[PDB]
Amino acid sequence: NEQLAKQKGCMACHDLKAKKVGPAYADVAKKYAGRKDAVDYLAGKIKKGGSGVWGSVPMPPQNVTDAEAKQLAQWILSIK
Ligand code: HEC
């Protein structure tokens, strides 16, 4: 929803249409669509991190469960 992206700290480097540090959620959903692994793939870089798709900025790992992480990839996609 929204309170799940604040208490955690994902909005720190993200935002619907507020290009700041990380890739705004909106842009993240546009990068994928119809993929058969957009949930495991996204949530994958969510519970681990990495870089190379948005530049060289190496994103840090996060401490989230595969459940809330799955809701962040399914919710981020539902966002235009
Ligand atoms: C800044 C210190 C960040 C914090 C804190 C979080 N994320 Fe992040 N995220 C960041 C960057 C720089 C990137 C892009 C990697 C790069 O090339 O630099 C990302 C990317 C994501 C993605 C998409 C990755 C993909 O497969 O394209 C997701 C889904 C994502 N981030 C989720 C996420 C969540 C849930 C966070 C809170 C726990 C979070 N990020 C924090 C930078 C930063």
Curated annotation (Swiss-Prot):
Binds 1 heme c group covalently per subunit. It comes from the Bacteria. GO terms for molecular function: electron transfer activity; heme binding; iron ion binding. Heme c binds at residues 10, 13-14, 59. Keywords: Electron transport, Heme, Iron, Metal-binding, Signal, Transport. Disulfide bonds: none annotated. Reacts with hydrogenase. Belongs to the cytochrome c family. This is Cytochrome c-552. It comes from Hydrogenobacter thermophilus (strain DSM 6534 / IAM 12695 / TK-6). The chain holds residues 19 to 98 of 98 of the full protein.
